[PDB]
Design a protein around this motif. Structure first.
Motif, PDB file in Angstrom:
ATOM      1  N   UNK A 296     -31.076   5.524   8.221  1.00 17.99           N
ATOM      2  CA  UNK A 296     -31.025   4.444   7.236  1.00 17.99           C
ATOM      3  C   UNK A 296     -30.078   4.779   6.076  1.00 17.99           C
ATOM      4  N   UNK A 297     -30.011   6.053   5.694  1.00 16.87           N
ATOM      5  CA  UNK A 297     -29.098   6.512   4.638  1.00 16.87           C
ATOM      6  C   UNK A 297     -27.631   6.422   5.047  1.00 16.87           C
ATOM      7  N   UNK A 298     -27.346   6.732   6.312  1.00 16.14           N
ATOM      8  CA  UNK A 298     -26.001   6.569   6.874  1.00 16.14           C
ATOM      9  C   UNK A 298     -25.656   5.078   6.971  1.00 16.14           C
ATOM     10  N   UNK A 299     -26.538   4.310   7.615  1.00 11.28           N
ATOM     11  CA  UNK A 299     -26.384   2.859   7.800  1.00 11.28           C
ATOM     12  C   UNK A 299     -25.977   2.158   6.504  1.00 11.28           C
ATOM     13  N   UNK A 300     -26.712   2.428   5.426  1.00 10.55           N
ATOM     14  CA  UNK A 300     -26.458   1.801   4.119  1.00 10.55           C
ATOM     15  C   UNK A 300     -25.193   2.301   3.410  1.00 10.55           C
ATOM     16  N   UNK A 301     -24.831   3.567   3.606  1.00 12.48           N
ATOM     17  CA  UNK A 301     -23.575   4.095   3.070  1.00 12.48           C
ATOM     18  C   UNK A 301     -22.369   3.501   3.803  1.00 12.48           C
ATOM     19  N   UNK A 302     -22.514   3.305   5.114  1.00 17.68           N
ATOM     20  CA  UNK A 302     -21.499   2.626   5.923  1.00 17.68           C
ATOM     21  C   UNK A 302     -21.376   1.149   5.577  1.00 17.68           C
ATOM     22  N   UNK A 303     -22.519   0.497   5.369  1.00 15.95           N
ATOM     23  CA  UNK A 303     -22.583  -0.914   4.957  1.00 15.95           C
ATOM     24  C   UNK A 303     -21.799  -1.172   3.670  1.00 15.95           C
TER      25      UNK A 303
ATOM     26  N   UNK B 177     -19.383   0.872   2.410  1.00 10.06           N
ATOM     27  CA  UNK B 177     -17.965   1.102   2.724  1.00 10.06           C
ATOM     28  C   UNK B 177     -17.380  -0.100   3.473  1.00 10.06           C
ATOM     29  N   UNK B 178     -18.138  -0.625   4.435  1.00 13.03           N
ATOM     30  CA  UNK B 178     -17.740  -1.801   5.209  1.00 13.03           C
ATOM     31  C   UNK B 178     -17.469  -2.997   4.302  1.00 13.03           C
ATOM     32  N   UNK B 179     -18.485  -3.405   3.545  1.00 12.06           N
ATOM     33  CA  UNK B 179     -18.419  -4.623   2.727  1.00 12.06           C
ATOM     34  C   UNK B 179     -17.475  -4.523   1.526  1.00 12.06           C
ATOM     35  N   UNK B 180     -17.284  -3.319   0.989  1.00 17.85           N
ATOM     36  CA  UNK B 180     -16.246  -3.076  -0.015  1.00 17.85           C
ATOM     37  C   UNK B 180     -14.853  -3.300   0.570  1.00 17.85           C
ATOM     38  N   UNK B 181     -14.643  -2.798   1.788  1.00 15.95           N
ATOM     39  CA  UNK B 181     -13.364  -2.929   2.493  1.00 15.95           C
ATOM     40  C   UNK B 181     -13.050  -4.385   2.843  1.00 15.95           C
ATOM     41  N   UNK B 182     -14.058  -5.120   3.309  1.00 19.20           N
ATOM     42  CA  UNK B 182     -13.890  -6.539   3.658  1.00 19.20           C
ATOM     43  C   UNK B 182     -13.728  -7.439   2.427  1.00 19.20           C
ATOM     44  N   UNK B 183     -14.524  -7.197   1.386  1.00 21.34           N
ATOM     45  CA  UNK B 183     -14.401  -7.920   0.110  1.00 21.34           C
ATOM     46  C   UNK B 183     -13.002  -7.744  -0.497  1.00 21.34           C
ATOM     47  N   UNK B 184     -12.473  -6.525  -0.411  1.00 21.01           N
ATOM     48  CA  UNK B 184     -11.160  -6.190  -0.966  1.00 21.01           C
ATOM     49  C   UNK B 184     -10.021  -6.853  -0.193  1.00 21.01           C
ATOM     50  N   UNK B 185     -10.085  -6.790   1.136  1.00 21.34           N
ATOM     51  CA  UNK B 185      -9.077  -7.414   2.004  1.00 21.34           C
ATOM     52  C   UNK B 185      -9.058  -8.933   1.877  1.00 21.34           C
ATOM     53  N   UNK B 186     -10.235  -9.528   1.692  1.00 17.79           N
ATOM     54  CA  UNK B 186     -10.353 -10.969   1.484  1.00 17.79           C
ATOM     55  C   UNK B 186      -9.740 -11.413   0.144  1.00 17.79           C
TER      56      UNK B 186
END
Ligand code: GDP
Ligand code: PN6
Ligand code: CA
Ligand code: MG
Lengths: 57, 424
Positions: A1-8, A10-19
């Motif tokens: 769960x700690x990995x999942x949320x740290x990846x989440x 990183x994921x959503x920061x990357x997508x928010x930024x690209x958008x």
């Protein structure tokens, strides 16, 4: 769960930024596209003015 | 049953743990390099309990030194008796645990735990008859608290029939490193209720008050608190480390001290309190060790009732006078000892006194007044938890709020259970 949320995060920061960076490049290009199209509309008006001098002689 | 495996985890665990080996090595006549330079054969008769014998007649502690950062374990190795420990038994990580129970128990400490257990297996393997484990740690930090209780859980899986005892330092606002200590302690207490046979509740509140009030030290350091801890740890381990016609291992002691499985949190105490010239009389030791001021857990024994008491006297004194004095306090304060466990106060005497004192006494009390300690940590917990304060540090390491709710509930059940036997 700690990995999942740290990846989440990183994921959503990357997508928010690209958008945002893409949306900005669309906007700034559409702003400069409008500015040049108004300036090109003057060149078309100045071609009618120079024709209406010659077509009145 | 002779050999005990010692483990020390975290800054606090390694600090009080290093003092334990400083005190008992002097008592067994072992110098800083590991060579024996005593005089009595009584110093070597049960040296196997805490030491392995190496080539050249060297004595190496059966001690495993754990931390998630190098700092404190580098201090231990540089310190006065640091050279005596086996180098393979220094098992450490790098990033630390930032006073975070979750880091110790679930993430950072998970990465290190299996290599610590390999050293435990190494020491347990070459033991004729392993009687159990002892652990030094705090419950307020990250490593000792989180990883210490993880190790305890793993050791119980691999060695389900061995005794697990702890020397567990409790946090207090008076001696406080971070505001999240009540969280770390509540998460640890729930682990100890399940997985230990005994836990010695060293309260830093009580160690401070003893240093401040009844020792006239204005500005007590951790060394001053640890001096009181190491003296007590020597006292509770005396009856295993020496004779004298006492036929007892950890299980036998645990059988006679723990009437109910969850209620195994003891109130340690020492007499006389030091930091002397006139040696104490047997009446004075008896009054002092039963005195609230000399208790290492900040509870008033008058507010509870004693389930069992154990008292081990050290030095050359009349056993007749000891029996008379121990019977004097029971028969004159009989309301504070439960009537439904006959003859619950037991006593031993050891001839060899500790360093510096001509005679001393170590008090071990399974009192229902220890609920006060758990209530105090439960209040500090709820104050923060009702507003979910500082929880982001634990939820970022993958924990759920449900696990806090459970732990809160489990400790308040422990308090309810202590209350049941106080009124019965
Ligand atoms: N008695 C005592 N308590 C300590 C000592 N060092 C830290 N503590 C207490 O332990 C808690 C902090 O835990 P610590 O052991 O430093 O963290 P860890 O290294 O992550 O286990 C606090 O409640 C401190 O009051 C010490 O040397 N002696
Ligand atoms: C008769 C007498 C005084 C020996 C006794 N009866 C029940 N308990 C004890 C003492 C002890 N009881 C213990 O449970 C005890 C625990 C212990 C010992 C070594 C290491 C860790 C814990 N240490 C003790 O000295
Ligand atoms: Ca890592
Ligand atoms: Mg610390």
């Amino acid at each position: 769960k700690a990995i999942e949320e740290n990846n989440n995060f990183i994921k959503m920061a990357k997508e928010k930024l690209a958008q945002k960076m893409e949306s900005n490049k669309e906007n700034r290009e559409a702003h400069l596209a409008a500015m040049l199209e108004r300036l090109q509309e003057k060149d078309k008006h100045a071609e009618e003015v120079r024709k209406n001098k010659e077509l009145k002689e | 049953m002779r050999e005990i495996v010692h483990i020390q985890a975290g800054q606090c665990g390694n600090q009080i743990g290093a003092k334990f080996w400083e005190v008992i090595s002097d008592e067994h006549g072992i110098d800083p390099t590991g060579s024996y330079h005593g005089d009595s054969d009584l110093q070597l008769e049960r040296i196997n309990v805490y030491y392995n014998e190496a080539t050249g007649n060297k004595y190496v502690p059966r001690a495993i030194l754990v931390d998630l950062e190098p700092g404190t374990m580098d201090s231990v190795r540089s310190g006065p008796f640091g050279q005596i420990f086996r180098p393979d038994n220094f098992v450490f990580g790098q990033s630390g645990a930032g006073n975070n129970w979750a880091k110790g128990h679930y993430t950072e400490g998970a990465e290190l735990v299996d290599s610590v257990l390999d050293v435990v297996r190494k020491e347990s393997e070459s033991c004729d008859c392993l009687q159990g484990f002892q652990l030094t740690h705090s419950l307020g930090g990250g490593t000792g608290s989180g990883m210490g209780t993880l190790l305890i859980s793993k050791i119980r899986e691999e060695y389900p029939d061995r005794i697990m005892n702890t020397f567990s330092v409790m946090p207090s606002p008076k001696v406080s490193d971070t505001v999240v200590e009540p969280y770390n302690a509540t998460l640890s207490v729930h682990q100890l209720v399940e997985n230990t046979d005994e836990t010695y509740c060293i309260d830093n509140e009580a160690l401070y008050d003893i240093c401040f009030r009844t020792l006239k030290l204005t500005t007590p350091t951790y060394g001053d608190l640890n001096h009181l801890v190491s003296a007590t740890m020597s006292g509770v381990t005396t009856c295993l480390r020496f004779p004298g016609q006492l036929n007892a291992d950890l299980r036998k002691l645990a059988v006679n001290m723990v009437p109910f499985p969850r209620l195994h949190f003891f109130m340690p105490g020492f007499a006389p309190l030091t930091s002397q010239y006139r040696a104490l009389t047997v009446p004075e030791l008896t009054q002092q060790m039963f005195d609230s001021k000399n208790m290492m857990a900040a509870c008033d024994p008058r507010h509870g009732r004693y389930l069992t008491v154990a008292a081990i006297f050290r030095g050359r004194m009349s056993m007749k006078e000891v029996d008379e004095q121990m019977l004097n306090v029971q028969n004159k304060n009989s309301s504070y000892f439960v009537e439904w466990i006959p003859n619950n106060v037991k006593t031993a005497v050891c001839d060899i006194p500790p360093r510096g004192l001509k005679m001393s006494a170590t008090f071990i009390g399974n009192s229902t007044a220890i609920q006060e300690l758990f209530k105090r940590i439960s209040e500090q917990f709820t104050a923060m938890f009702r507003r979910k304060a500082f929880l982001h540090w634990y939820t970022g390491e993958g924990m759920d709020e449900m696990e806090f709710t459970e732990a809160e509930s489990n400790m308040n059940d422990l308090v309810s259970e202590y209350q049941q036997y106080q009124d019965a």
